[PDB]
C-alpha cells in the first residue's frame, strides 16, 4: 500500500529515506522515549522508532516519534510532510499547502467500506485490556497523565449521520477503561459533542484510530469547513477512495490499516481531571489540572506489531508547529481569497511559535481597491478572527509581494521595519481568543477573548502608486552583471552545496 | 602597536586570525568593492581588503570592508569586535558590552599629545587634492553620492573647549573640497553644531579621521553620556592614554596612527544635497535627497599605503547592527540600572533589525518592588524613551531571568508567547522617534515623534510569587540523569563540534 495511504508503509518510507533510527534495545515509555523524541525535534534529527518499549505486551505497542517534524537539510526540510501526501521529498511548503487545499474545490470522494483489514488482526474486549497496563508514555515530567493520544484521529459523527469528523485532540489515560481529553470550542469534536448533548439521549459513539493513513492525519490536523467529512476531502485530495472497516462495537468506520483502534463513547455528562500537558507554545504549568471530557473505551483492535505514533511537543520544532500552524495558515489563505481579499500566500512563522500568520498581499490588486491601512486591516481581521480557521492565530502580519512568507527572517524584517507599533495596527478584543497561549490562559486578561491584532507591514505607497524603495541587499542594490561577476569570482578571490 | 590601538595592526590581526581576504587584482570602487563586502556581510565571510582599488593614486587609498561584521562560526562569532578591544576572539557579547561599559565608573584617562605619527607621512593641501578624483565608493546602486565616510570618526569640540566628541555619522562627497552628511538631533555632533550656531561667529573646526584605533571607533559608535570626551573614556577602557597629534590647519587632535585625516570645517550656515543612502534598516528610497550638513575640507594627511575602512550597510549583518544596536543596548542596560530598575542584561536582537531591545529582568528584585505590569512598563519606557540612548529603539521587550537576551530565538519565543498584544503593552507617542526606520520617515505618521512601545513579556506571577511554569523543552521537561543518559547514548543509538 502507498505510504500516504498506510502508516506501516509510511514508516518504511522513512527508513528508505534514511530518515529513521530504529531502536531495538529497551526504552522506557516513562519519559525516555519522549526525551529522545524531544531531542530529535529540537535538532531536526531522524525520526525514532522504539521497537522495544518497556511494558509492551501482546503486541501493544511500539512507538514512532516525530512523525511530522523537520529534517536537517534545507533541500528536504519538509520531507516528512511530503511523505504524508505522495509528494516528492523536496516539496516546498507552498506545494504541501496547495496539496492540502486542493480538495476544497473538488467533489468529495466518499470512502469505500471493506469487510476487514489489518486493524482487525488482534482484539481485546472489555475483560482483556487495561489502559494503565499498556506502555503509554509520560511525555513531559510534569504532565498530569500519560498521554496515549497525541497523533491519532478521533472519529465522531453528527446525530443525524450527515457529518463524520476526523481530528486530532489530546487525551490521557484516566483509568483502566477511560481517557480524559481536550474538547473545546470551536473545534469540530466539540461542535459535534454539543449536538449530542442537546439531543440528550446518549453518549457519543466514538472511535480513536492511531497510525492512520498519513494523508488522513494531515486532514485531521487542518480546519477544513464545518460540516465537511474529512474522509471525502482526503479521498478527493489523494484521488482515491479511502478504505474503511466498521468498528466491532459501534457503527463508525475506521481506516482499514489503522495500527490501533479504540472503540467506545465520549460522555455527554461526565468529566475528569485532564492536563496539565507540555504544549505547542513551549510550556507546562505544573499542577494546572482542569476538567476535561471523558471517554470510555469498550474495545481495542490492532495490527500485529502495532506502532503508536507520538508527538513529543513543546519548543520548536514538532507537529504542533509544522502541521497546526501551517495547515491553519493554508485555510486562512483560502478564506481570505474567498472573501475577495488580495492574499496570495499565508504561513505561520515558526519564530512566532505559530501564533502569527503572515499574509502576502498582491499589491497590484490592493492598489485597485483604493483603500487605506485602517480600512484594510479591519477587513482582514474581521474575516480571519471571526472564523474558526483564525482561532489559533493572535497576530496577522500583512506584507507586500517582495516578502516570502515562508521565510521567517524576511517576515521578521518586514514586521520590524514596515509596521509602526500602534498606528499601523488594529487590536481586536471582541473575538475568540486561544487560551493555550500562556499570555491568554495564564495571562492578565480574559482567557477566551481578545488579545488579537492585525499588524500592517505594507508601506504607504503600496496602497497608492507602488513600492518606492529598493532593498539594501546584495540582490537589489547591485546590477545583474556585477552580481554575476562577484559570484563567478567568489572562490577565485578566496571566499567560501544545495543537497547537503 | 597593539591591534586595539592601531588600525594597521588590527588589519594584521584579521590576517593572522584567518579572517581576511586580500584582493590584489583591480577592483572598482563604483559598486564592486561594496558588492563584495555586502556578500561578505550577508554570509558572515572573511573581511575583504582591496589592495588594488581602481582610481587609487599617490597612496589614496585601499579599502577594508566589513571591519565589525560577524564570523561564520559560533565560537568566535564576535571575534572582529573582540579584536577592537584586546579581548579573546571567543569573547561573548556580554563580555564585549561589559568592556564597553567598564569606563563608565572609572576616572577618564586623558590623551597624550605627541609631536608626530604615521598619519603625517603624507599630506595634500587645498591645491593638491580633489575629493571627486579619489576612489571613493558608490556603496549601493541608488545612493545619492559616493559615501567616503562610513567608518571614520568625526571630531568636533564645544566652543568652550571642554568637550571633544568622537562619533560616526555618514558623509558623501559634494564636490572637490566638500562633503555633505547627516547631522541630526539628538546626536552629539548635532548638539555641538548647535552650540557653534548659537555663538554665531564661525564654522565649526572639524576633523574626520579614518582608520582610527579600533577601541576608539567602538566608542565613536556608542551613546556615552552628554559632555563626556570619548578619548578619555577609551583611555580608561583600555587602561592606556591614547596618543594624539595636532591637526595642521586647526587645533583639534587626531589619533597618531589614523590612516587618513581630513581637516576643515562643518558649516553653521550652508547645506547641500545628502542621501539617499542604503541604510541600517535594509532600505534605500531612491531619489529621496534631503539637505544635509556641509563640510569643507582644507587638508588631507595620510599614512603610506593608507587603508579606508568601509561599511557596506543594509540587510543583516553589518556594523550598523553589531555596533549600533549592541552598543545602544549596553548603554540602555546601564541607564536602567542607574534609574533603580532591576535590569541585568540588554541586547538589540538582529531579527528586529536592531529596532528592539530585550531587557532581562532580575525577577527576585521585581517581586520586591510589589508593582504591576502597567506601572513597570511605564517606568521603563519613560526612562529609556526619554533618553538619547533609547533614540534608535522603538520596542522594548521585558523578559524574565530564564531568557538569554543575546539569543534572538529565545527573545522571539518569549515575546510571542508571554506578551498579550495591546493589554501587555504601553504605546509612547510623545517621545522622539527615529526617522530612519521606514515606518517612521516613510510611514503613516510623524517622522520624528512616537511609534514606540514597551512590550511586557513578563508573566503575571513573575511580579508576585515567582515563575509558575516549566518549559516543554529537553532541558526542563526531563530529569538530569535521564537527559545525561540520552546524550551519552545519542550516537550509539544512531543519531547525529563547538569550534567548527
Ligand atoms: C497536529 C496536532 C494537532 C492538535 C493537537 C496536537 C497535535 C500533534 C497535540 C500534540 C495532541 C497537541 C494538542 C494541542 C491542541 C490544540 C488545541 C486547540 C487548538 C489548536 C491546538 C490539540 C488538542 O489537544 N485539541 C485540539 O482541539 N486541537 C489540537 N490539535 C489541533 C487540531 O487537530 C486542529 O485544530 C484541527 O483543525 C481540528 O480538526 P477540526 O475540528 O477542524 O475537524 N492537540
Ligand atoms: C557604526 C555606525 C554608526 C552610525 C552610522 C554608521 C555606522 C557604520 C553608517 C554606516 C555610516 C550608517 C549611518 C546611520 C546612522 C544613524 C543615524 C542615527 C542614529 C543611528 C544611526 C549614522 C549616521 O549617519 N548618523 C548618526 O547620527 N549616527 C550614525 N551612526 C550611529 C552613531 O555612531 C551612534 O549613534 C553614536 O552613539 C553617535 O555618537 P555620539 O553622538 O553619542 O557621540 N551612521
Ligand atoms: K480536521
Ligand atoms: K505600515
Ligand atoms: K560616541
Ligand atoms: K505579559
Ligand atoms: Mn473537521
Ligand atoms: Mn559622544
Determine what percent of chain A falls in helix, strand and coil, rounding each to the nearest 5: 30, 25, 45
- Number of domains present in the structure of chain A: 3
Cβ contact A47:A69 at 8 Å: yes
A chain contacts of residue B351, beta-carbon cutoff 8 Å: 351, 409, 412, 416
Q: What does the alpha-carbon distance between residue B155 and residue A127 come to, in Å, rounded to a whole number?
A: 89
If we measure between CA atoms, which residue out of B126, B60, B33, B54 comes closest to residue B260? Answer: B60
- Beta carbons within 8 Å of A481's beta carbon, 6+ residues apart: none
Residues within 8 A of B (CB atoms), A 54-93 only: 72
Give the closest residue (by CA) to ligand 1 atom 28. A169
**Is residue B393 within 8 Å of residue B384, measured between CB atoms?**
yes
User: Which H or E run contains A297?
Assistant: strand A290-302
Q: What cell numbers appear for A444 in the block?
A: 492578565
Q: Which residues contact A103 (CB under 8 A, 6 or more apart)?
A: A233, A234, A236, A237
| Residues 353-372 of chain A whose Cβ lies under 8 A from any Cβ of chain B | 353, 355-356
Return d(Cα B173, Cα B152) in angstroms, integer. Answer: 14
Give the C-alpha separation, A397 to A410, whole Å. 12
Q: Which of chain A's residues have a Cβ under 8 Å away from the Cβ of B479?
A: 31, 141
Which set of grid coordinates corresponds to residue B337? Answer: 540600572
Question: In this structure, how many other beta carbons lie within 10 angstroms of the beta carbon of residue A274?
Answer: 23
Cell, residue B130: 580633489
Residue A221 CB less than 6 A away from ligand 1:
yes
Contact yes or no for B27/B33 (Cβ under 8 A): yes
Contact between chains at B486 and A450 (C-beta distance less than 8 A)? no
Asked if A334 and A228 count as a contact pair (C-beta separation under 8 A), the reply is no
Asked whether the beta carbons of residue B474 and residue A450 sit closer than 8 angstroms, the reply is no
Q: How far apart are CA B294 and CA B179, in angstroms?
A: 6
Crossing angle for the helix pair A324-338 and A93-101, to the nearest 10 degrees: 60
Tell me if B313 sits within 8 A of B294, measured CB to CB.
Answer: no
- When computed from its CA atoms, the radius of gyration of chain B, rounded to whole angstroms, is 24
Same domain, residue pair B90 and B229 = yes
A240 is in an annotated binding site: no
| Start-to-end Cα distance in chain A | 30
d(CA A251, CA A164): 12
- Whole-number Å distance between alpha carbons of B468 and B109: 48
Compute CA A117 distance to the chain's CA centroid, rounded to the nearest angstrom: 27
Task: State whether A199 and A136 are in the same domain.
Answer: yes
10 Å CB burial of residue B306 (0-12, 13-18, 19+) is buried
- Do both A417 and A339 map to the same domain? yes
Give the Cα separation of A50 and A34 in Å (integer): 10
Same domain, B374 and B395: yes
Q: Is B133 annotated as a binding residue?
A: no
Chain A residues near residue B485 by CB distance under 8 angstroms: 32
Residue A479: CB atoms within 10 A of its CB come to 11
**Mutation probe of ligand 1 site: the residue of A144, A167, A433, A440 with most atoms within 8 A of C-beta:** A167
Asked if residue A135 and residue A87 are part of one domain, the reply reads yes
Element (H, E) at B398: strand B395-399
SS3 B296: strand
CB contact (8 A) between residue B284 and residue A31: no
- The strand pair at B20-23 and A470-471 is best described as unpaired
The DSSP output letter for A457 is -
- A432 CB under 6 A from ligand 1? no
- Do A134 and A60 contact (CB within 8 A), yes or no? yes
Task: Read off the C-alpha cell for B4.
Answer: 586595539
Q: Which ligand is nearest to the CA of A421?
A: 4
Instruction: Report the alpha-carbon distance of residue A425 to residue A440 in Å, rounded.
Output: 19
Distance CA B360, CA B346 (A): 6
Task: List C-alpha distances in Å: B278 to A213, B210, B282, B313.
Answer: 52, 20, 7, 7
Euclidean distance between CA atoms A192 and B87, whole angstroms: 65
Cell of B276: 539617499
Q: Which set of grid coordinates corresponds to residue A245?
A: 472497516
What's the CA angle centered on A323, arms A320 and A328, to 5 degrees?
A: 105
CA–CA distance, B482 with A189 (Å, rounded to integer): 36
C-alpha A151 chain-centroid distance: 10
How far, in Å, CA of A147 to CA of A168, rounded? Answer: 13
Ligand 2, residues at Cβ distance < 6 Å: B 150-151, 165, 167-170, 182, 184, 187-189, 220-223, 279-280, 311, 313, 319-320, 323-324, 392, 436
A360 and A314 part of one domain = no
For B381, the enclosing helix (H) or strand (E) is: helix B373-385
**Burial classification of residue A407, based on how many CB atoms lie within 10 Å of its CB (0-12 exposed, 13-18 middle, 19 or more buried):** middle
Distance CA A395, CA A260 (A): 38
For residue B321, what are the CA distances in angstroms to B116, B311, B349? 35, 11, 9
CB pairs under 8 A between A and B: 280
- Tell me the residue length of chain B: 500
Which residues in B lie closer than 8 A to residue A313 (C-beta atoms)? Answer: 472
Q: Which residue of A has its CA nearest to B489?
A: A36
Residues within 5 A (CB) of ion ligand 7:
A 165, 188
How far apart are the C-alpha atoms of B333 and A86, rounded to whole Å?
A: 53
Return the SS3 of B483. Answer: helix
Measured distance CA(B161)–CA(B250) in Å, rounded: 13
Question: Whole-angstrom Cα distance, residue B485 to residue B480?
Answer: 9
Sequence-distant (6+) residues with CB within 8 A of B435 are B184, B441, B447, B448
* Interchain contact, B351 vs A409, CB within 8 Å: yes
B460 CB neighbours in chain A (<8 A) are 442-444
The ligand minimizing its distance to the Cα of A187 is 1
- What is the per-residue DSSP string for A316-359? SSSHHHHTHHHHHHHHHHHHHHHTT--EEEEE--GGGTT-EEEE
Contacts by A36-39, CB closer than 8 A, 24 or more apart = A36/A65, A36/B486, A36/B493, A37/A65, A37/A66, A37/A310, A37/A312, A38/A312, A38/A314, A38/B473, A38/B474, A38/B477, A38/B478, A39/B474, A39/B486, A39/B490, A39/B495
Cell of A459: 508601506
Which residues in chain A are contacts of B42 at CB distance < 8 A? 473-474
Cα–Cα distances (Å) from B422 to A452, B170, B390, in that order, read: 8, 37, 21
CA distances A166 to A206, A212, A322, B329, Å, are: 11, 11, 19, 50
Q: What is the DSSP string of A186-234?
A: TSHHHHHHHHHHHH-SSPEEEEEEES--HHHHHHHTS-PPTT--HHHHH
Which of B422, B470, B482 is nearest residue A427 as measured by Cβ atoms?
A: B422
* Three-class SS state of A5: helix
Q: Is B352 on the interface with A (CB under 8 A)?
A: yes
| A15 marked among binding-site residues | no
Residues A107, A96, A219, A390, CA torsion sign:
negative
Element (H, E) at A34: helix A32-43
User: Using CB atoms within 10 A of its CB, is residue A484 exposed (0-12), middle (13-18) or buried (19+)?
Assistant: exposed
Chain centroid to Cα A221, Å, comes to 4
Distance of alpha carbon A92 from alpha carbon B71, whole angstroms: 30
DSSP string, B133-188: GS-PPB-STT-SS---BSS-EEEEE-TTSS-EEEE---EEEEETTEEEE---TTSH
CA dist., res. B351 & res. A412, Å (int) = 6
Asked how this structure was determined, the answer is X-ray
Tally the C-alpha atoms within 13 A of residue A32's C-alpha that lie toward its C-beta. Answer: 23
| Residue B120 and residue B135 in one domain | yes
Cell numbers given for B43:
554570509
Q: Is the CB of residue A473 less than 8 Å away from at least one CB of chain B? A: yes
Chain B residue with Cα closest to A491: B21
Asked if B43 has any chain A CB less than 8 Å from its own CB, the reply is yes
Quick one: A275 and A348 in the same domain? Answer: no
Report whether B156 contacts B265 (CB < 8 A). Answer: no
Rg of chain A on CA atoms, in Å: 24
With CA atoms as reference, report the closest residue to A397 among A431, A423, A424: A424
Q: Check A35 against B486: CB less than 8 A apart.
A: yes
> Which positions ≥6 away from B439 have C-beta within 8 Å?
A417, A418, A419, A420, A424, A459, B451
Please list, residue by residue across B486-499, b when 16 or more beta carbons sit within 10 angstroms of its beta carbon and e when fewer do: beeebeebebeeee
Contacts of B214 (CB under 8 A, 6+ apart): B3, B4, B5, B7, B10, B67, B83, B84, B85
Q: Could you tell me whether strands A204-210 and A178-181 are parallel, antiparallel, or unpaired per DSSP bridges? A: unpaired
Beta bridge mates, A144: none
Residues B252 and B298 in one domain: yes
Distance, in Å, from the CA atom of A401 to the CA atom of B287, rounded to the nearest integer, reads: 22
Q: Looking at A296, A314, A330, which one is the last position of a domain?
A: A330
How far is A449 from B141, CA to CA, in rounded Å? 49
- CA–CA distance, A171 with A117 (Å, rounded to integer): 25
Residue A484: which H helix or E strand, with range?
Answer: helix A480-493
What is the residue with the minimal CA distance to atom 7 of ligand 1?
Answer: A320
- Resolution in Å, one decimal place: 1.0
**Residues of B annotated as part of the active site:** 279
CA–CA separation, A291 and B398 (whole Å): 33
C-alpha cell belonging to residue A191:
461542535
Q: In A74-115, where does DSSP find H-type helix? A: 79-83, 93-101
Burial environment of residue A105 by CB neighbours within 10 A (0 to 12, 13 to 18, 19 or more): exposed
Q: Residue A488: which residues within 8 A CB-CB, separation 6 or more?
A: none
C-alpha B249: how far from chain center: 30
In sequence order, what E strands does A373-489 have?
A: 395-399, 425-428, 452-456, 470-471
Q: C-alpha A5: how far from its chain's center?
A: 18
- CB of B466 within 8 A of CB of B367? yes
Nearest residue on chain B to A457, judged by CA atoms? Answer: B439
Cβ-based neighbour number of residue B89 at 10 Å = 18
CA B450 to chain CA centroid, Å, is 23
Residue nearest to atom 39 of ligand 2 (CA): B167
Q: Can you tell me the distance from the alpha carbon of B442 to that of A109, in angstroms, rounded to the nearest whole number?
A: 52
Q: Give exposure, A14-40, as e/b (b: 16+ Cβ within 10 Å).
A: beebebbbbbeeebbbbbbbbbbbbbb
Residues 405-464 of A with CB under 8 A from B: 409, 412-413, 416-425, 427, 429, 437-440, 442-445, 450-453, 459-460
β-strand partners of A30: A138
What is d(CA B53, CA B63) in angstroms, rounded to the nearest whole number? 8
Question: Distance from B272 to chain A by nearest Cα, in Å?
Answer: 22
Q: Greatest CA span in chain A, whole angstroms?
A: 80
CA distance A436 to A285: 11
**Omega before A62 cis (within 30°)?**
no
Domain end (from B426, B444, B459): B459
Q: Do B469 and A39 touch (CB under 8 A)?
A: no
Q: What angle do CA B244, B248, B253 make, to 5 degrees?
A: 25
Distance of CA A289 to the CA centre of its chain: 24
Q: Chain A within 8 Å of B485 (Cβ-Cβ)?
A: yes
Q: What angle in degrees, to the nearest 10, is found between the helix axes of A373-385 and A324-338?
A: 120
> What's CA B360's distance to the chain center, in Å?
21
Closest Cα partner for A356 from A434, A288, A284, A287?
A434
Contact status of A486 with chain B (Cβ, < 8 Å): yes
How many other β-carbons are positioned within 10 Å of the β-carbon of residue A106?
A: 13
Pick from B81, B193, B280 the residue to mutate for probing ligand 2's pocket: most ligand atoms within 8 Å of its CB.
B280
- Report the DSSP pairing between strands B20-23 and B47-50: parallel
| The length of chain A, given as a count of residues | 500
**Domain hosting residue B481, numbered range:** 460-500
Question: Concatenated DSSP letters for B242-285?
Answer: PEEEE-SSSS-EEETT-SEEEEEEEEEEEEEEE-----TTSEE-
Can you tell me whether residue B98 is helix, strand or coil?
A: helix
Name the residue of B63, B65, B66, B170 to mutate for ligand 2: max ligand atoms within 8 A of Cβ. B170
On whether both A260 and A339 belong to a single domain, the answer is no
Query: Dihedral (C-alpha) B467, B473, B478, B480: value to the nearest 10 degrees?
Result: -90
- Is B268 a known ligand-binding residue? no
Do residues B368 and B252 share a domain? no
Q: Which B residues 245-304 touch A at CB under 8 Å?
A: 278-279, 281-286
Q: Are residues B448 and B348 in the same domain?
A: yes
Amino acid at each position: 500500500q502507498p505510504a500516504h495511504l498506510c502508516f506501516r508503509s509510511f514508516v518504511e518510507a522513512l527508513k528508505v529515506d534514511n530518515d529513521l533510527v530504529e531502536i531495538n534495545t529497551p526504552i522506557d515509555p516513562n519519559l525516555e522515549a519522549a526525551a529522545i523524541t524531544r531531542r530529535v525535534c529540537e535538532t531536526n534529527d531522524k525520526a525514532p522508532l522504539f521497537n522495544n518499549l518497556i511494558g509492551m505486551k501482546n503486541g501493544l505497542f511500539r512507538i514512532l516519534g516525530a512523525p511530522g517534524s523537520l529534517r536537517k537539510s534545507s533541500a528536504d526540510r519538509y520531507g516528512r510532510l511530503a511523505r504524508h501526501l505522495a509528494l516528492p521529498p523536496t516539496a516546498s511548503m507552498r506545494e504541501i499547502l496547495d496539496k492540502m487545499l486542493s480538495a476544497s474545490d473538488m467533489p468529495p470522494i466518499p470512502p469505500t467500506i471493506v469487510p476487514t483489514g489489518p486493524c482487525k488482526e488482534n482484539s481485546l474486549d472489555d475483560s482483556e485490556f487495561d489502559l494503565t497496563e499498556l506502555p503509554v508514555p509520560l511525555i513531559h515530567k510534569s504532565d498530569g497523565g500519560k498521554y496515549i493520544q497525541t497523533y491519532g484521529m478521533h472519529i465522531v459523527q453528527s446525530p443525524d449521520g450527515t457529518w463524520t469528523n476526523w481530528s486530532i485532540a489530546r487525551a490521557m489515560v484516566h483509568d483502566k477503561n477511560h481517557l480524559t481529553g481536550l474538547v473545546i470550542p470551536p473545534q469540530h469534536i466539540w461542535q459535534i459533542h454539543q449536538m449530542w448533548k442537546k439531543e440528550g439521549r446518549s453518549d457519543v459513539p466514538w472511535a480513536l484510530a492511531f497510525g492512520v493513513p498519513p494523508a488522513a492525519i494531515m486532514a485531521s490536523s487542518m480546519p477544513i469547513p464545518d460540516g465537511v467529512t474529512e474522509a471525502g476531502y482526503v479521498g478527493a485530495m489523494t484521488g482515491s477512495s479511502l478504505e474503511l472497516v466498521k468498528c466491532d462495537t459501534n457503527d463508525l468506520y475506521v481506516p482499514a490499516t489503522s495500527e490501533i483502534v479504540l472503540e467506545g463513547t465520549l460522555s455527554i455528562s461526565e468529566t475528569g481531571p485532564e492536563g496539565p500537558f507540555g504544549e505547542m507554545h513551549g510550556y507546562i504549568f505544573p499542577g494546572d489540572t482542569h476538567l476535561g471530557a471523558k471517554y470510555k473505551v469498550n474495545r481495542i483492535t490492532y495490527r500485529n506489531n502495532a506502532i503508536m505514533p507520538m508527538s513529543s511537543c513543546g519548543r520548536l520544532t514538532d507537529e504542533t508547529h509544522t502541521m497546526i500552524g501551517s495547515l491553519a495558515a493554508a485555510e486562512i489563505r483560502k478564506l481570505c481569497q474567498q472573501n475577495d481579499l488580495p492574499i496570495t500566500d499565508a504561513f505561520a512563522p515558526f519564530e512566532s511559535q505559530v501564533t502569527w500568520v503572515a499574509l502576502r498581499v498582491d499589491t497590484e490588486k490592493l492598489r485597485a481597491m483604493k483603500t487605506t491601512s485602517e480600512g484594510f486591516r479591519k477587513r482582514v481581521g474581521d474575516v480571519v478572527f471571526n472564523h474558526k480557521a483564525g482561532y489559533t492565530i493572535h497576530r496577522l502580519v500583512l506584507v507586500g509581494d517582495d516578502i516570502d512568507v515562508y521565510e521567517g527572517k524576511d517576515v521578521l524584517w518586514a514586521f520590524s521595519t514596515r509596521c509602526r507599533p500602534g498606528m499601523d495596527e488594529t487590536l481586536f478584543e471582541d473575538v475568540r481568543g486561544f487560551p493555550l497561549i500562556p499570555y491568554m490562559g495564564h495571562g492578565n486578561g480574559p482567557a477566551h477573548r481578545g488579545g488579537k491584532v492585525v499588524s500592517d507591514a505594507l508601506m504607504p505607497t503600496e496602497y497608492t502608486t507602488g513600492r518606492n524603495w529598493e532593498a539594501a541587499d546584495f540582490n537589489q542594490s547591485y546590477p545583474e552583471d556585477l552580481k554575476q561577476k562577484v559570484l563567478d569570482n567568489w572562490t577565485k578571490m578566496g571566499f567560501s552545496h544545495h543537497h547537503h
